[PDB]
Amino acid sequence: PLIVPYNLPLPGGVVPRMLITILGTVKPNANRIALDFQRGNDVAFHFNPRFNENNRRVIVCNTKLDNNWGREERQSVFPFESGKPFKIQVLVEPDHFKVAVNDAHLLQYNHRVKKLNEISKLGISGDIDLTSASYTMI
Numbered sequence: 554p555l556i557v558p559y560n561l562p563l564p565g566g567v568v569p570r571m572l573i574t575i576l577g578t579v580k581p582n583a584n585r586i587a588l589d590f591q592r593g594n595d596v597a598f599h600f601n602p603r604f605n606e607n608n609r610r611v612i613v614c615n616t617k618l619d620n621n622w623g624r625e626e627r628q629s630v631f632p633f634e635s636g637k638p639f640k641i642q643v644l645v646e647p648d649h650f651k652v653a654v655n656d657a658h659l660l661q662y663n664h665r666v667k668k669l670n671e672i673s674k675l676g677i678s679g680d681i682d683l684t685s686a687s688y689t690m691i
């Protein structure tokens with residue numbers, strides 16, 4: 554597979570119609586997964602499945618600017634399961650990142666970082682076996 558944490562360069566940043574596909578398997582007894590769409594040290598889009606926050610499963614999304622986290626967006630729909638293979642599809646649209654897991658729409662995240670062409674790296678981390686990480690223009 555791939556070494557986690559994994560850096561996928563996004564040459565020239567992201568743009569509407571860019572689809573990022575992450576294939577992996579959640580480890581047994583997982584605690585977290587994280588996708589970090591970065592603009593230098595800033596995180597434009599943090600996607601953070603938490604498997605045990607006060608014995609609840611929740612996806613936390615956020616943006617980090619100048620090393621400060623903003624206001625969390627929280628989603629209780631939680632399609633991930635410890636031990637199971639997943640596919641995460643992040644489609645860049647004009648106003649948001651659109652996320653589907655296992656071919657089912659999960660959430661959207663409004664663009665806070667406006668310079669989409671400077672979001673030039675995706676960090677993939679947490680309790681997964683990472684199989685593949687790629688992008689295509691649709």
Ligand SMILES: OC[C@H]1O[C@@H](S)[C@H](O)[C@@H](O)[C@H]1O
Nearest residue numbers: 599601613614615622623625
């Ligand atoms: O707001 C998101 C942010 O939340 C805090 S609690 C975590 O330590 C960070 O890794 C990140 O997930």
Ligand SMILES: [Mg+2]
Nearest residue numbers: 581582635636
């Ligand atoms: Mg298991």
Ligand SMILES: [Mg+2]
Nearest residue numbers: 653654655656
């Ligand atoms: Mg999918």
Ligand SMILES: [Mg+2]
Nearest residue numbers: 665666667668
């Ligand atoms: Mg900006």
